């Protein structure tokens, strides 16, 4: 319904959950450091990189297992809207932007396990074919 959807959609906003990985390590360059993030975290590959007002907008990419680089399909989200939610696999992440080039590392491996069936993007909501 109109109101059925609504309630649900809110449910869907909040799903940056599961047991997160708390530690991301980053690089550190005197140029990088400056325009660094606020908080960057993950539970999945669905990773959030929040930004301060006064922190530039990098462009970040993922390092697939190939080791070679790739570009993630990302988006930013938030009331803050600053954060960039990326929806592609990768441990590391580069965070280029012209000369400069950071590269936060994600740091978790529960290997060989993790897969389930979300059943949408975020598990809150669901797909009930039409």
């Amino acid at each position: 319904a109109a109101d059925k959807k609504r309630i649900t959609q809110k449910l869907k906003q909040t799903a940056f959950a599961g047991a997160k990985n708390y530690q991301y390590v980053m690089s550190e360059q005197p140029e990088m450091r400056s325009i660094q993030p606020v908080h960057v975290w993950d539970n999945y590959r669905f990773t959030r990189f929040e930004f301060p007002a006064n922190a530039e907008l990098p462009q970040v990419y993922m390092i697939s297992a190939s080791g070679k680089e790739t570009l993630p399909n990302s988006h930013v989200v938030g009331e803050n809207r600053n954060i960039i939610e990326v929806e592609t696999v990768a441990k590391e992440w580069r965070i280029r932007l012209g000369d400069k080039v950071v590269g936060v590392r994600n740091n978790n491996f529960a290997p060989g396990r993790g897969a389930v069936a979300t059943g949408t993007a975020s598990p809150d909501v669901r797909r009930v074919q039409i």
Partner: peptide
């Protein structure tokens, strides 16, 4: 012959400080 691509600008691997500052909350 030809040239290839130049391997990527590689970030500091040596220095490594943690990302996060305070602890994250959900915004959205």
């Amino acid at each position: 012959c030809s040239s290839g691509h130049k391997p990527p600008p590689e970030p500091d691997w040596s220095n490594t400080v943690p990302v996060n500052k305070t602890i994250p909350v959900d915004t959205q």
